[PDB]
Each structure stands twice: as C-alpha cells, then as structure tokens.
Amino acid sequence: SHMYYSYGNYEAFARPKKPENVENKSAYLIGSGLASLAAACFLIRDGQMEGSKIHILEELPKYVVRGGRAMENHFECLWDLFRSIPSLEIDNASVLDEFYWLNKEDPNYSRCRVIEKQGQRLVTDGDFTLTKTAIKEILDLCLTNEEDLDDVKITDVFSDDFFNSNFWIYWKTMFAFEPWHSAMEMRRYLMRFVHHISGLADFSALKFTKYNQYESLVLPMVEYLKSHGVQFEYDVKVEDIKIDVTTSQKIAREILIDRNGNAESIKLTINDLVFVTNGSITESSTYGDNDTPAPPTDELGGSWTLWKNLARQSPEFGNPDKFCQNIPKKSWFVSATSTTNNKEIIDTIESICKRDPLAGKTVTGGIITINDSAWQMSFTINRQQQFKDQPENEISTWIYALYSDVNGDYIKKPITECSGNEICQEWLYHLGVSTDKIEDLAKHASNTIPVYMPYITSYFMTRAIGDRPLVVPHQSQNLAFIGNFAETERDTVFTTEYSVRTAMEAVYQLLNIDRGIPEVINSPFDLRVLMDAIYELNDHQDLREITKDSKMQKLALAGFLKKIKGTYIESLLKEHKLL
Amino acid sequence: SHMYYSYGNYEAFARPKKPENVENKSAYLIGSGLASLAAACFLIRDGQMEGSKIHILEELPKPLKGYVVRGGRAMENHFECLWDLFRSIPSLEIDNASVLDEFYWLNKEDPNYSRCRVIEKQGQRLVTDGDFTLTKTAIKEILDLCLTNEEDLDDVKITDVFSDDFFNSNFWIYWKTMFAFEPWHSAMEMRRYLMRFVHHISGLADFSALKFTKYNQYESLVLPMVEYLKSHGVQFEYDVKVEDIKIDVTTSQKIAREILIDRNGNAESIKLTINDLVFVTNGSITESSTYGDNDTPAPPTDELGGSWTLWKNLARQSPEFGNPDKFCQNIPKKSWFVSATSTTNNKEIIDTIESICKRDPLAGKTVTGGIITINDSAWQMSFTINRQQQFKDQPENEISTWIYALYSDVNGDYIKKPITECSGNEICQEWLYHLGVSTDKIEDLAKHASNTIPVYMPYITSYFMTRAIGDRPLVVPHQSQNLAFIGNFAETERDTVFTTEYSVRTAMEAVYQLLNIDRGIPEVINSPFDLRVLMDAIYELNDHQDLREITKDSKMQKLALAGFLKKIKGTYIESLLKEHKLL
C-alpha cells in the first residue's frame, strides 16, 4: 500500500528508480527539525526532486548540550540516510563513516553506572536484581497485544518487585521513563532493544557522535541540502494548513503562515506535498543562568498550536491534547549543562567514572544515576569537548532530574526553583564533594545553564491507538506527518531513528518510491536473541538455575530436556548459556 | 577468527579503514572463477590493495559448435555477500548503475515465476502441481533433520534420514530437481539448504523467489567484475597452470612459500613471502568437462584435471587442507553428468513450449521461470528457458533451452539409451518427445531444426557428495598467514554450496581475515531463527493448513493444541499465529 518493508543487503544497496511525475511536484516541510531535514534528504536522494522545489519553512530567522546523543547499531533508517551525507570533519567520508570509525576506536561503556550515599557505587551495579515475578511481568507485557494497552500506564502492568529492581533504575534513567508513562511505549522499547539487553547496565550498546547532535547530524544535512539547492525559508510560522477531508480523499489545499509578521498563504495543488512534524518536545523551552532559574511555562507554541488546528479537521490527524495537556507537575522538565575547569570537580568525576574527563575519550560512557537522589538525577560527561571551540581544560556535564516537584537533598528546593549554581550544588553533593566546598565551586568555579522544557516528557504520555496520525493518513494525497508524534509500527519514539524512519516512510509513500523501507530490526523474533534475553534478564542464570525453586517449571523443563537432549536445540541453548 | 559476522544497515553501508600495511602486500588468485574474481574485487575495494599487486593466474590463454548455457543458477534477495559485492561493480548495460541496480530493476520489471513446474505423460501438467503433498511423517522427518546437529551428519546420505512418504511427495520432486540433489547426496547439505532458504518456502513450487540476470552468467556477473578489475590495474596472467603450492606448516604457522606453475609449457616458480597472499579455489565441478555436438555425444571422462590435482597436492601437506577424494572420487555412475543447450528458431518447437509454459519464448521476458521437470521421464530430466536471448550476439528469432538429466545410466523413454551415450540431437529428441511433439516430427525437428550441444561434467555433482566436517578446509585454515581457500569446496558456517553467494562469501571471508579488515561480514540470513518465518514454514509445509486442521487426526495433538490455545488466548502469540495463518 504505497510502501513495503524489507531487510538485508539487497534492498539496502539497491537504488529506487526515479519516481513517476516527481518532476512536476514540490515539497513543503514545516520546521527544520531532524525529521524535516531527513525528509528533504530522502526527497533529494530517492525522490530525485529538485532542491528548488523543496521548501523548508522554519520559525527562526537567519554552553548548553543535548539535542540528541545515544545511537545504536540497529538505527536502520538513520544509517541508510547518513551513509549519503558527507562528513564535515573527514574528507571523502560520510557521517556514517566518521561515526563508525570513531566508535570502533573508542567504544562506549560505563565503569560505574549508578551511585548512592554521596558517591559510592551501588554494590549490585551490573545486576538487574529482577525477581521471577518481575520478569514474568515483563514477558506478560510483551505478550499483551498493543491494542489492549490504550491509555495503560507503566504502573498498571508492573508490581513493586519490578520497581525495586536495578533493571528499572537503568531503564527509566537511560530512557527517561516516568511510572505514569505509556505502557504501550514501554512495551515497544522492551521488544525494540532486546538485542542490547547484554549492554543495558554498562551502556556497552551505546554509540555517540563526536560532538553534539547539531554539529554532527544537523549541520551535515543542512550542508547536503544547501549544496543541492534546497530553499530554506526563515521568519515563517505555519499557523494552519487547510485540508479538504472528503469521503474519498484528503488533500492539503493551503498553508497559512506568518512570514516575518505578515499574514500570507501558500496555495497547494495535489502535487505539492506537505510534511508536518506534529508536536514538539522542545517547544516553549526557557533558559536560566548560573544565578537564575529557567522560568517554568505551560505555553503552547507554534508546533502544538498547529497540530491542534490540524486535529480539528479530522480525528485521523491525531489527538495532541493527550500529549501536551495534563503533564504531571512531577515530570522531568529541567536539564542543566554545568561547565568547569576546576580540577577538584574533574578529579572527583574521574575517581567515580575511572576515566580522565579531559582525555578526549569516553568519560562516564553514558549517564551515572544517583539512585538515592530526591530529584532522581542522572548526569553524563560525553567525549570532551562536545563543542568545536571550547577550551581543552573544560568539561561540560549534562544534568537532568526525573522528578521536578520534590525538594533536593542538599538544596531543599524543587529543581524548578533552582538556579544553575544550585543544581550544580545538589549534583556536587551527590558526587560526595565536601559540603564546605560545594557552594563556592558551583558559584565561582563552574557555570551551569538550566533549561526548563514543558514538553520534554511528551513523547511517552499514555496514548491510545489513533492519538498519533499515521505517517500518511488513509486517503491522503499530499499530506504526511513525520517525527516522534506520528504513528508507525513497532519503532520507539524519543529516538532519532524514529524521526528518520517516519520521514522515509512519508517520502516513499507520497512519491510511491519503488524500494523497500528497512523494517524495525527483527530482534524480538530472533530465537537467538530471545535466548540471550532470558539469560541476561535472569542475571546470567541457566534454565536449571532459573527453575530451581519451582516445582511446575522444573518438571516442564525436565520433559523438555529429555526431548531435546543431543539435538540442535540443546546446542543452541548451550551456546547462549541457558544450559 | 580474524573477522566477525554482522547484519543490518550500519555494517552494510560502513566502510572499513584501509587495513594495516596493505601497501606492502600482494595477492595471487588461482584461477578466474567467480570466487577468485570476487576476492580480487574485495582486495581492491576494501583491502585498498594496489591492482598492480593482484595477480590472477588462469590456465587459459587469452572452438564450440553451438551456444552453451550454464553457470546461471537462480539468485535470491538474501545473497547477502553477493549484493554487497555487486553494488560496487558498474553495470555494463545501464549507465550510472551497478550490477545490483540492473538486476534489481530487471527483476521488478519482469518478476520470475513459473506457470507450469512439472509435466508428465508427454506434455501434460502434473495435476497436484502447486502442492507439496507432504504427510505428517514426512514433515516430521524434515524438522527432525533440521534439529540434528551438523556434527552428527558426517557422511550421512539423504536416504538415511528420509522415508517413503517424503520421497513420494511433490516436495521432493520440486526440491531435488531445482537444487540437483541425488538421494545419495549429503544430508548435511540438504539440512543447510532446508534452513538456508526456509524464508522462500512459499516460492518453492512456482519459483517466485528466484531472480535471474539479464544474460548468461559470464556476460552478467563475470565480465562486469573483469572490467572493474582491469580498470583498477589488476594483472591477469594466462597460460598459467598451478600444479602445487609449497606450504611450510609448523606449530604456530602455515605459510605459502612457493607457487609451482606451468606457464605456457615452461615449469616456473613464483616465490612467496608471508606478505604475498594466495587464494586457492580448491576443486572444481566443471573441471575435465567435455563437449559433443548435434551429432556426437560429449565423451565421458574420469580425468582429474588441474584443479583436483592441485587440491590433492595441497591435502598431502596437512589434514587441515581437506579431503579432495570425498568429492572427486567414487562418484556414482547414475549421477548427473550431462547437460545440453538446444538452440532453435523453429516455430513448431517454440509454439510447443509456449503451449506448456504459457508464455511466448521470444518476447524477451520470463519463459519457463526456471526448470520444468518431466516427472515421469526415465532420465529424470528437467529443462529451463530463461529470458531470451541469453547471448547478446544471438539472433532475436532464436531460443536456447538448457536441459539436464539427474540419472545418467538409464534408457530414455523415446531414445532408449542412457544420456551419456546420446548425441546432442538425441537428447533433443528425448526432450521433444516429453514435450508432446508428434513422433512423426521429432527426428526432423531435433536434427534439422535444432542445434543441441551436450556437455559431460564428471564433477558436476561433486559439491553435494556426502562429507564429514574437516573434509573442506577452512577459508583460512588455523594459523594460516597468507593462504586462503575459497569457493564451494571451502568450509564456512551455515551457508549452502552450489550457489554464487557461497563463492562470494568465501572470497569476502578470505580477504577480510587475511588482511584483518575491520568491517563486519553479513551473516548467513537469520531466517531459520525467525519465529515469523518458522510460522510461515509450518503453514506452507502443511499445504496451507492452520493448526486446527493439522492436529485433527491426533486426538492427543488435538488436546495439546487445546491447551496451548487457552494459555495464549487473547495474547500477542495468538495474534502472530493468526497473522501467519496458523489460527
């Protein structure tokens, strides 16, 4: 139905024929976020649309870290795209090459993932400490149809054993799950990343770009698009799109914009495609400084207002209110980037992560979680420096806190009432810095910039099938929805992969491109991977240990083992350490 | 061990860094087969070896009485190494396009499928054509074979693991003819085939999973590689017969020291260092092939040509170099030996084929979509007509049919002689007979309207001979510093021989190991570990029966299924089973 899914090298390496009649078509891409950028690259590369017919409408005209960071090997659509984007750092190489080599020579992993009691490593760090009841809850969730998970919370499907496991510590902090978030999305994550469970506790599965996501992913694509003549249109806010929703078709007819404070309108025909990135987790963000809190806001911005205006033209365009209203005041809102050249801080980090922060390699290898922090705070030092023109004596630490309405342990205030230096103080406290030194180090030996993001948890809010518009709604002729609030099967939002996937599916479907789209990696269907998951989830126990204290399963196991003794199934189980 | 297996787009699209010290290395590739050429291409593209330091050593120096077809078995999408290679090889047909791009577009424009797979009784379609007619016993035997460890199948034959129900099934007709399996062949390799291609079980009977090049293999695969290699300065050396390679074998090292060659009559010797790599294609299924013509049989032979002599000479220097005798010796005389290429512009023959395969042979698109099997032919004969013409110099009013017989020592039904005693025109008459041509016309249409070239291949079944782990050398034997074995008599995991993929796979593995290239090699496709594929396979193997139909007969299975279903009622597992038609 205008696209199909594939895997393996045949479809990966094959090139689509130029799509029919693309020469008389144009594209309008609302926003210059990564999904729109990705949709424009696919239009250039696989649609062979001329860049002059491709219009990226962005609101803006013309340290803080984190647009994105962690990636994995099985970002199948992202790597398809970025093998074709030249590096801005290596000659005759793609962003993929740069990244692939970088991560070979300095492969990621954490030497200390969770701390407590002011800088001590958690004694069970590395184990999931899941009881058999918790594991059963995990499988039961995977065995639940997604259809049966409308509006279901994480707390509805897990008991306290689960929430007391180390597993949950590692999972909620690395992915930013709150207990009230969508069990649907939690389920997709479990199945989506099962091949990396072996790397969950020590982040051995993660891979990072050289610099921040903008210097390493966005700018390369902007440059790719500029060299192909893509028209970037600034000072343009898209307020509405008039869509004709009939019994047989949906056609976007008109883009209503404010172009430099002036109300204008872009008339569309059936051959003008519109790519809407609906919803935004970064909109309405505010910034503090070392002595000022990022001020809280519940303002809807352009992105949310546009989706709401689209949603009033058809329920098939989604339900933005499920995502941008009723966000619990406890949710993550604040992140901070703390910069310092102070040797005591840097040295304290080294004595925890066991790596020289200033060496230019992995440091924390991903977030260290402060497990007994009131704020449920985690922080990471990536490869330093994360910016191109930053002094090589400086580190930049990124801090976030899952709980926003709880007094700190040292700064007895909610993070939303904290200046940069105060967030720094709470962090240094949990690092174990002598409290007699913390205040001055935060105020005069560091600079910490907080950001308040009202919608940073928005992707994970409990939802129902239908709350997210399909990438190409039923009967849509020239309208697609892209990014992490659009609907596609199996893949997990809050990833850059999801933004590139939806962009590729939108371009391919709307132009009818005759090439397969890589399916979400088939890990949860791979018996090899499933064998490993059991092994790892049970903290490296074989099937005899797993069933030890249970009469019913040790009898079923016995029967099974008599049946499989000396077979290939036995050999597989042994290779995967289950026997 | 100097490699790793991978899958997914990350490693597929990634480029390896230039391997360490490759500027001081050279390569010698014995022969111009596809594996050797494939290796040369990986040397260029991923090794970044200088072309002038790559030396292809080929016997031949650079007279047949008709077009000859072969080498062009089908391909499938999940030839993972092959497409990794040919995405990088320029098409000679389409500008600005790889061989993959050309193949890809062609097979979407003219997808392959068969409209008539098995005939009998002189041109009549098999009534059950389409079905596997597998009994539950037979199905249990297939599954029981896959659940057997490879190690316990040493020297086991296919007749040792299957019984009467299976051998009487359409499945086995389809299977044995399309893959050229003999009942005495390796059950280990049959097992690898079962698992290797389980994702295509739905395409077995109508060939809808097969893909074909535009032209014969040499024009579509080999010649693009040769021009890639020559454009990069690669050295081709003709008139070179390699007789032996001196290998110093020691506790911690195997090193090729010397290549003993006959170069245009003269006994010569290429001296090697550890930095000169040698790639050996050990054994050959086409070695010692002889040709006949429309009036002459291809004369039978037992000669061990150069390839089999070279391997025996290597096997003498270490048991890690394999057992060539398990493959080139004691080949049964009933084995497939003869194929033939029958070329005609005669409208009665062409129209007769059209009436069977339901397509115009001369339109330039799929014709038979792969072999048609004559199920009741004494010879167990099959024949295919690919897209026409398979040769760029051939007239547009001509077709060329490829014909083979699995049984070489059995009288024909019309020409009452074994195929080995038959002239090109006699093979054609036996073929025409089974097409339904009136016997009054068969002699004249085979003798004056057709030109049939037979080929006798002593070793054409040799890939499938019953073997034991260890008979095939590893692609890079343990501790080998500059010696690799490539092609379909070298050992790698899971993959299936008698396929171009296996040749390219070994090539890739050899080059990557010997040069320590830091990029993943695509694993054999993971279909046999894929629950969705295994579900589809149960459905298809039981001729599209959901599980309730499958268990009707066994009141106890009817029960076990009763329980399973309540354990999974309303769950994802149920939904998957319904999606894959088992409920």
Ligand SMILES: Cc1cc2nc3c(=O)[nH]c(=O)nc-3n(C[C@H](O)[C@H](O)[C@H](O)COP(=O)(O)OP(=O)(O)OC[C@H]3O[C@@H](n4cnc5c(N)ncnc54)[C@H](O)[C@@H]3O)c2cc1C
């Ligand atoms: C701090 C942070 C860290 C992250 N880290 C990771 C990570 O480590 N790994 C990972 O996989 N993922 C991560 N993510 C998720 C990832 O960043 C997102 O999935 C992705 O960046 C979203 O891209 P998008 O363009 O689809 O969404 P957006 O970029 O939000 O798309 C909307 C954009 O278009 C513009 N726009 C919106 N509305 C309008 C309008 N009406 N008119 C004009 N312009 C408009 C806005 O400027 C906005 O930026 C992270 C996200 C954040 C916020």
Ligand SMILES: CCCCCCCC[C@@H](O)CCCCCCCCC(=O)O
């Ligand atoms: C496990 C394999 C790949 C996982 C995909 C990663 C993307 C996860 C996503 O939920 C966004 C993360 C949000 C911010 C949390 C802190 C960042 C920690 C981190 O970068 O992992």
Ligand SMILES: CCCCCCCC/C=C\CCCCCCCC(=O)O
């Ligand atoms: C696990 C048991 C498997 C059950 C039977 C498996 C059947 C495999 C079937 C079909 C393959 C059909 C042909 C696919 C491409 C062949 C390419 C070639 O000729 O080399």
Ligand SMILES: [K+]
């Ligand atoms: K899929």
